[PDB]
């Protein structure tokens, strides 16, 4: 250390031997923390908070865990950031990306101990990932021409995604709900059109998807409670003292009877607007704002249903289901399109009462009712079902799939191995380490179940080298099998994102050799 000081008090510097030490300790720390939640037989963690008023949640997702953990190592924050982005991109594989990105760094520290310059490893890995992604592409199978065959693939993808979650207790029941829900969107990737309503009580198997729609609102007082063959007008306008006349006007009169005259003119304005609404020949009215008690009785005298305070989400969803138009100014009744549902009634679920729409016109949106025993099950069920809906929506956008259960990893690990046997130099060593990292992912799945991982992986390595490119693990019995027969299937887009993102982070971390920290701010709260 130079005798002269260059840093202010509290600032610290770390260099080559210490910098690479700290960065590797952090990465493997986060990788080993989440390995327990991987595969069809991983277990779940408990997150309890000291700051957020002792909030408690039970989860298996690898991205939810990494968001709540308060990491402070600079290198560990890079790993958390990729997992959050991956969740917002395809919605699955958050656990696989971080484990793989951590296993690459575990092999990278051993190579440095053998006196190989870091730039040599990166150039070596860059060739390894190119040959790995190309081999994956040649493994893709693309359906979509046959509805019957494509329908089978959607059931296989949804069945695999739900395996590692709590929904595996009822996988058959929950596979049908997830698939049929996505077929309603008619190819539009608006996932917000699916409203998952979760309310406590009853068994987890009582959950279902409603054939129509459900609204958790309340109708006006002294209005019909149920209508057959309804015509719906969807509006976004003011009705509680709509007289917000944008100007800065004011009333200046010299008597009292003038005020009582102007006051009566206010009600005439509201009454006239109501008549123009009823001119459309509607029998159901939906508004996104409040409804005052004076216009409430106008509908109550005319025999109409008025729903109030259905926010932007509640209105846009109704537009897709019934096909109406969100209208305002009510001046041209011919140009506005109304909705149509066969029946509207009030239903009771648990304790609450919700509005039931049945026999809708379009049905391009839906609602899902979830039941359960604890708030932890309801949250876990909803979060698990989010993974299934997203990955299915990506499949419809790009309908090419790749086999899973370790069949995919072993194929790419072999393609890099063949390349490393022709390349001279120290780059050959680095490429082999890439194959050691990919093959760990099938190993970790076997370890969690209590099987001889070394024996099973050894059989897979031989099977894939001799041309049986569909071999892979079978969890229910701990032997080998064919995926074309069993049906374990992933998405090409999901696996591609897992491979490319993971290989990048081990590149950005590995190029770092100096760590510098500014003197932290002190806690002096308000």
């Amino acid at each position: 250390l130079a005798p002269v000081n260059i840093f202010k008090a509290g600032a610290d510097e770390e260099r080559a031997e210490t910098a690479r030490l700290t960065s590797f300790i952090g990465a493997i720390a986060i990788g080993d923390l989440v390995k327990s939640t991987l595969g069809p037989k991983g277990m779940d963690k408990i997150l309890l908070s000291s700051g957020r008023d002792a909030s408690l949640m039970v989860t298996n997702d690898g991205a939810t865990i990494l968001k709540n953990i308060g990491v402070d190592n600079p290198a560990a924050k890079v790993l958390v950031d990729m997992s959050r982005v991956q969740d917002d991109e395809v919605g699955d594989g958050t656990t696989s990306v971080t484990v793989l990105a951590a296993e690459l760094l575990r092999e990278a520290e051993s190579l440095i101990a053998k006196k190989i310059h870091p730039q040599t490893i990166i150039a070596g890995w860059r060739e390894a990932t190119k040959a790995a992604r190309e081999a994956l592409l040649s493994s893709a199978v693309d359906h979509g021409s046959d509805e019957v065959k494509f329908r089978q693939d959607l059931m296989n993808i949804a069945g695999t995604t739900l395996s590692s979650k709590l929904l595996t207790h009822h996988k058959d029941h929950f596979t049908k709900l997830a698939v049929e829900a996505v077929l309603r969107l008619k190819g539009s990737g608006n996932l917000e059109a699916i409203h998952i309503i979760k309310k406590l009580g009853g068994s987890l198997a009582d959950s279902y998807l409603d054939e129509g729609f459900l609204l958790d609102k309340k109708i006006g007082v002294n209005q019909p409670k149920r209508i057959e063959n309804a015509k719906i007008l969807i509006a976004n306008t003011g009705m509680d003292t709509d007289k917000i006349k944008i100007f800065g006007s004011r009333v200046r009169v010299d008597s009292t009877a003038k005020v009582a005259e102007i006051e009566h003119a206010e009600k005439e304005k509201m009454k006239e607007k109501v008549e123009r609404i009823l001119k459309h020949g509607i029998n159901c009215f939906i508004n996104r704002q409040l409804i005052y008690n004076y216009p409430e009785q106008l509908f109550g005298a005319a025999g109409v249903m008025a729903i109030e305070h259905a926010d932007f989400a509640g209105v846009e969803r109704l537009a897709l289901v019934t096909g109406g138009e969100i209208a305002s100014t009510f001046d041209h009744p011919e140009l506005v399109k109304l909705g149509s549902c066969k029946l509207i009634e009030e239903v009771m679920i648990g304790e609450d009462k919700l509005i039931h729409f049945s026999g809708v016109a379009l049905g391009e949106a839906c609602t899902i009712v979830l039941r359960g025993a604890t708030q932890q099950i309801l949250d876990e069920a909803e979060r698990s079902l989010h993974d299934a809906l997203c990955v299915l929506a990506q499949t419809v956008k790009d309908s090419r799939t790749v086999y899973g259960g370790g069949c995919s990893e072993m194929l790419m690990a072999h393609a890099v191995t063949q390349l490393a046997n022709r390349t001279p130099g120290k780059e050959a060593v680095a490429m082999e380490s890439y194959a050691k990292a990919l093959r760990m992912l099938p190993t970790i799945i076997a370890d969690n179940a209590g099987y001889d991982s070394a024996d099973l992986v050894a059989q897979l390595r031989a099977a894939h080298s001799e041309g049986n490119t569909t071999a892979g693990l079978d969890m229910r019995e701990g032997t080998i099998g064919d995926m074309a027969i069993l049906g374990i299937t992933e998405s090409f887009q999901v696996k591609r994102q897992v491979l490319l993102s993971a290989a990048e982070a081990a590149e950005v971390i590995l190029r770092v050799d100096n760590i510098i920290k500014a003197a932290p701010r002190k806690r002096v709260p308000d």
Partner: protein, 344 residues
């Protein structure tokens, strides 16, 4: 951190933010130092960055090694003014020889190969080198579509660099238009047009309001009704005034009213709400139109043109963006950056 085989540093902020970088100026900027001489090296790095932008880390290594060689001369009994004078003389001899071995290459849109080779050399030192052949192409084209050749000047305010997380680094592309972080106002508007005539506005879609303090007195019922009629009529005239000029889409800087939003949809006219200041002046240059502050002043000679306007949707998130493309010759252009991490 010098040369193509150089390594990087990972900065840590006051609050905890992590930044991995290789640029010479940034490392000395995020660093916190106390010694007064250290701050003099920081200011030296920044000055080179402003003037040129490349060669920020090379200069401090040259400056540092220039001081180290002077330690022996000081010890052997040389007045440092003699040393300082000597260094100045050597630099003059070095500089005059430097441009004796120079080679003028070219500046022309026709060839663009020498310009790509120079761009390749600078990018060869960063993590972008994984695809630096592609990135070189984007950089050179972006300058030559904004460059004023006669004044020999380029303006960086006409080049917008925007990055969004997700996707892949190779998805970076050059858009010879404008991208904004907005969407259509009404959810039921169509998501694309193909012969867009652009109407850029600055006034909001609301009834007028003078700025000076004012009061309007309602003294009778007929006065009240005449005010009620004036409201709803004012909503009609603005939209009629827009349509007669032949415009196809409306762009506004302020918000719309609930009544005005629906009437636009009823007249088959897409619109955008709450756009930014610098965005408007870019769209005016990009589409070749003009900015109007009142509905009354709108004419058919002030509309812009645009080949395609679309709303592009990303993955799981609700984030949506609007892109303006395929116009005529444009002096504005944007760079779109993608990548799997905020640090990329």
């Amino acid at each position: 951190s010098l040369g193509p085989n150089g390594l990087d540093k990972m900065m840590v902020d006051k609050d905890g933010d992590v930044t991995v970088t290789n640029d010479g100026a940034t490392i000395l900027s995020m660093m916190d130092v106390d010694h007064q001489i250290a701050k003099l090296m920081v200011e030296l790095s920044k000055s080179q960055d402003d003037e040129i932008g490349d060669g920020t880390t090379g200069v401090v290594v040259l400056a540092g090694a220039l001081l180290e060689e002077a330690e022996q001369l000081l010890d052997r009994g040389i007045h440092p003014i003699r040393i300082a004078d000597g260094y100045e003389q050597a630099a003059r001899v070095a500089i005059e020889h430097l441009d004796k071995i120079s080679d003028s290459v070219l500046v022309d849109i026709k060839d663009t190969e020498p310009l790509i080779q120079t761009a390749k050399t600078t990018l060869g030192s960063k993590v972008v080198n994984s695809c630096h052949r592609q990135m070189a192409e984007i950089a050179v084209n972006a300058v030559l579509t904004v460059a004023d050749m006669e004044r020999r000047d380029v303006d960086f305010e006409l080049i917008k660099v925007e990055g969004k997380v997700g996707g892949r680094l190779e998805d970076t592309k050059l858009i010879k238009g404008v991208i904004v972080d907005k969407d259509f106002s009404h959810p039921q508007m169509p998501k694309k047009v193909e012969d867009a005539k652009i109407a850029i506005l600055t006034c909001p879609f609301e009834p007028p309001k003078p700025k000076t303090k004012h009061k309007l007195d309602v003294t009778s019922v007929e006065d009240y009704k005449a005010l009620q009629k004036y409201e709803k009529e004012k909503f009609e005239e603005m939209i009629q005034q827009i349509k007669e000029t032949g415009a196809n889409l409306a762009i506004c800087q302020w918000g719309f009213d609930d009544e005005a939003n629906h009437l636009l949809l009823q007249n088959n006219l897409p619109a955008v709400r709450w756009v930014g200041g610098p965005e408007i002046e870019l769209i005016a240059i990009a589409t070749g139109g003009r900015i109007v502050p009142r509905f009354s002043e709108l004419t058919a000679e002030k509309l812009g043109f645009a080949g395609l306007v679309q709303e592009i949707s990303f993955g799981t998130t609700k984030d949506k963006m609007l892109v303006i493309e395929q116009c005529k010759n444009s002096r504005a252009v944007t760079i779109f950056i993608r990548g799997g991490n905020k640090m990329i």
